[PDB]
Amino acid sequence: VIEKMNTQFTAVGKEFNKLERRMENLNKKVDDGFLDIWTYNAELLVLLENERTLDFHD
Amino acid sequence: SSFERFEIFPKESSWPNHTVTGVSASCSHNGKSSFYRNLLWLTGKNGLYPNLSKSYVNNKEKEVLVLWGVHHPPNIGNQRALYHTENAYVSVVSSHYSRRFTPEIAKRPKVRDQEGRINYYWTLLEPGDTIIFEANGNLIAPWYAFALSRGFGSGIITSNA
Amino acid sequence: KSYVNNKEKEVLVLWGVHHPPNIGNQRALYHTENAYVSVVSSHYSRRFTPEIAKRPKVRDQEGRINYYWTLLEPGDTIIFEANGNLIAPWYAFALSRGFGSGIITSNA
Ligand SMILES: *[C@@H]1O[C@H](CO)[C@@H](O[C@@H]2O[C@H](CO)[C@@H](O)[C@H](O)[C@H]2NC(C)=O)[C@H](O)[C@H]1NC(C)=O
Ligand SMILES: *[C@@H]1O[C@H](CO)[C@@H](O)[C@H](O)[C@H]1NC(C)=O
Numbered sequence A: 001v002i003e004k005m006n007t008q009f010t011a012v013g014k015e016f017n018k019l020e021r022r023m024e025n026l027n028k029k030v031d032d033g034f035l036d037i038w039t040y041n042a043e044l045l046v047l048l049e050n051e052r053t054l055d056f057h058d
Numbered sequence B: 001s002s003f004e005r006f007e008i009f010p011k012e013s014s015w016p017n018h019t020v021t022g023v024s025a026s027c028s029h030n031g032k033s034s035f036y037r038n039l040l041w042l043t044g045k046n047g048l049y050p051n052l053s054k055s056y057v058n059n060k061e062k063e064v065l066v067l068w069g070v071h072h073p074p075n076i077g078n079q080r081a082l083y084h085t086e087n088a089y090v091s092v093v094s095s096h097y098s099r100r101f102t103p104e105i106a107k108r109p110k111v112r113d114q115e116g117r118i119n120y121y122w123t124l125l126e127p128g129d130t131i132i133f134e135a136n137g138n139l140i141a142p143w144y145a146f147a148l149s150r151g152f153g154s155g156i157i158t159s160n161a
Numbered sequence C: 001k002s003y004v005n006n007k008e009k010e011v012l013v014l015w016g017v018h019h020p021p022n023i024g025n026q027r028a029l030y031h032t033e034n035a036y037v038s039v040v041s042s043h044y045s046r047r048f049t050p051e052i053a054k055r056p057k058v059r060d061q062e063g064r065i066n067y068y069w070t071l072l073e074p075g076d077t078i079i080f081e082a083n084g085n086l087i088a089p090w091y092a093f094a095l096s097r098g099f100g101s102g103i104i105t106s107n108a
Helices: A021-057 B076-082 C023-029
Strands: B002-007 B024-029 B032-034 B039-041 B052-057 B063-072 B090-094 B097-101 B117-125 B130-135 B139-142 B144-149 C002-004 C010-019 C037-041 C044-048 C064-072 C077-082 C093-095
Touching: B039 B063, B052 B139, B063 B090, B090 B117, B097 B117, B117 B130, B130 B139, C010 C037, C037 C064, C044 C064, C064 C077
Parallel strands: none
Antiparallel strands: B002 B144, B024 B032, B039 B139, B052 B130, B063 B117, B063 B139, B063 B144, B090 B097, B090 B130, C002 C077, C010 C064, C010 C093, C037 C044, C037 C077
């Protein structure tokens, strides 16, 4: 679970101007999209692994 | 990875035919009117503001970040006091860059204690290329420039830690 | 003209610039050919000039009006200047923005 995560050096934040609001909102859309995907998958993955782990031990 | 701040256009030898002095109260330092260290405000000398022409060759194996600005007086009297032509422009070109700028003189709401404005512009000069600067007024000249060697992108973080 | 934003709201200010199809039209409405308008605020600056040209007709017009706008923050000021071709702001909107939502197209 840990090793398959691809960790790369990154630069997450981006700056936008007053008239670049659509770009800012797309940048936000991208962050929220990725965040909801990773959050949903991380929560769900852990719950599924926990059910299997407890069943594994039983 | 490397940020060399070098003097691109040495003050004393680069501009002997005009004024390389002049400060603003708005940039005051320790009570004295002042200005930026990497930029030089150019004004006329003894009534003259000659056409300027400068050329920098990038002889380093680095990109060079060149900064400059354009003065935008609040009025005509200010432009005439500093520059002696109303139809002022500056021009900056390189093998793959070209911009022409003119002042926009207007009354503006004050910011700090100023009515006029200075716009800031920049370009990255690739190794082996050249930047040619021209002006007949309103030039804030590059004085220092940075020879850059860029690393893997990282970021600007805001924190008081 | 100078408008001071004395409301605790952003003010949306609209204006436009007239772009005559020809010289006779510009002279008929404005009495200078070297017309410009200028709009500034503490953090805004634009200068505009007319572009006079014959254009294909749209509706029944040969000329055009461009529309421009800015959001004025509380406490700031917009200074407008012109010597011709100004479509002046008359009304403006004092805004208080909510969480972003959207423009939806539907005949429902
Ligand atoms: C550097 O930052 C300081 C802090 O904001 C500036 O000091 C303020 O200057 C304004 C006038 O422009 C005064 O009304 C404030 O009272 C000052 N603040 C303090 C805490 O003394 C300073 O002017 C800035 N200097 C430069 C060169 O940008
Ligand atoms: C300064 O002006 C003189 C003419 O008075 C000219 O010969 C000289 O080349 C100029 N120097 C520079 C750096 O422009």
